[PDB]
């Protein structure tokens with residue numbers, strides 16, 4: 001009754017897992033040393049895969065090496081057994097990571113690899129890679145304990161369902177992340193719908209016909225127009241705002257969405273257009289609650305959730 005049930009919905013990589021971690025950070029029990037420890041294998045895997053993508057890129061993009069001696073380290077990492085039990089699970093043990101760390105460190109120092117990194121628009125590199133590559137100092141310490149920020153940036157896909165249960169001032173929340181469905185649809189108070197707002201110029205890896213924003217808009221359409229959710233507060237999170245702010249400076253959304261009007265290099269104009277894209281998916285209304293978020297930024301999410309909490313209670317009361 002007093003229980004607020006919130007679903008997190010949105011395509012994969014939209015920031016749902018990261019939002020759940022922020023709830024634990026902000027309103028729950030912060031990860032203790034053993035909890036943080038469990039992330040270490042994922043972080044190491046994120047780094048190994050990222051550098052593997054970068055060595056593969058500069059090769060396939062024909063960028064010349066910075067120092068030609070790094071070929072050896074490129075080969076070293078291209079020979080990493082992805083197939084193996086642990087690695088196939090998106091996990092790399094400490095001892096294994098430390099075997100590669102010298103190659104990784106030398107490769108990130110390379111101007112050719114730095115060049116490859118700059119042309120990342122041209123291939124698929126995980127959001128966390130540069131953050132961890134610049135943090136090779138601390139990951140490489142024999143008893144590295146991941147920090148809060150490291151855990152937020154650690155990328156592991158969600159295959160099933162995650163839940164975190166927390167209270168704010170004796171108000172209990174049940175928050176459920178359904179990966180990117182109909183079984184958790186029961187007794188829902190609010191839906192937070194996460195969008196990677198910076199992916200307007202990307203297609204689905206498994207379906208190059210489909211624009212990633214288009215894929216998000218179509219998912220949203222099926223939710224927002226379902227009668228089952230008529231009394232449910234639906235709140236749009238245009239996430240990855242830090243990335244959208246960078247991308248608008250260099251890419252024009254008009255090239256992708258012919259309906260855009262305004263200045264495509266103006267973040268505010270682009271955000272206005274995205275909001276209108278989602279609003280326009282609804283068949284029978286005229287407020288779509290929305291926030292421009294950066295799910296990895298704890299201070300942002302603190303403010304946003306404060307606002308969302310008020311929205312839900314104002315609505316969920318009335």
Ligand SMILES: Nc1nc2c(ncn2[C@@H]2O[C@H](COP(=O)(O)OP(=O)(O)O)[C@@H](O)[C@H]2O)c(=O)[nH]1
Nearest residue numbers: 012013014015016017018127153155240294295
């Ligand atoms: N730069 C940036 N990275 C983000 C943001 N939100 C999430 N990420 C990262 O993007 C990746 C995908 O996020 P994740 O929560 O796992 O998406 P999920 O598949 O919906 O659960 C992770 O590495 C997150 O750290 C954001 O707002 N900005």
